[PDB]
Amino acid sequence: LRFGEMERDCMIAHGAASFLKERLMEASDAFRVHICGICGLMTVIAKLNHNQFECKGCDNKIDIYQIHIPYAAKLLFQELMAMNITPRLYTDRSRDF
């Protein structure tokens, strides 16, 4: 079935935080990607076996994170990139506030 926009706004109202996620992630999309702790991208060439990780270019192998985001969102990003736009995914805020 469909947990559309309104069905969200509702849980938001309810304050039913986690449930909202559970609907959005675990019971739907939910995907695990790897990022470069330098250039917030999906670049990372994760061989999840020989634990190699790399990311030539920003050239890494050390600073690499892993995250969970809706596949659709991955796509959103990749799509945006295909449009030459860069959406950086950083795992730590540096702008304070």
């Binding site: 935080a17 986690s18 959005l24 702008r95």
Partner: protein, 112 residues
């Protein structure tokens, strides 16, 4: 005084029908419309232009148009918006998520 009117008028629209809404609601809205400076409209023209992140406004009326000028002016998004997280698959800072929980190792001993 404008707020005072903008409210009064909105209140009336809901009274004419013989319905009732607790001040606070109409207030809040009438307020969001005002604070900023004058009469900010509830439309892609107004509010969806504020300093709010990109990803957030991104989800209403202008999407791509908005995203494009986001990376072109290298914006930075806080990810404090309900939307922001929903798009990332993270727990939004909302009710249940307006705080964190921890295992106090100390108190975890007095208990036994």
């Amino acid at each position: 005084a404008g707020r005072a009117a903008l409210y009064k008028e909105v209140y009336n629209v809901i009274a004419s029908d013989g319905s009732y809404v607790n001040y606070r609601h109409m207030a809040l809205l009438v307020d969001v419309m005002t604070t900023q400076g004058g009469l900010t409209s509830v439309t892609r023209h107004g509010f969806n232009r504020s300093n709010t992140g990109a990803l957030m406004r991104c989800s209403f009326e202008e999407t791509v148009e908005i995203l494009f000028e986001a990376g072109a002016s290298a914006e930075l998004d806080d990810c404090r918006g309900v939307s922001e997280n929903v798009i990332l698959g993270q727990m939004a800072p909302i009710g249940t998520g307006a705080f964190d929980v921890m295992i106090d190792e100390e108190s975890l001993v007095k208990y036994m």
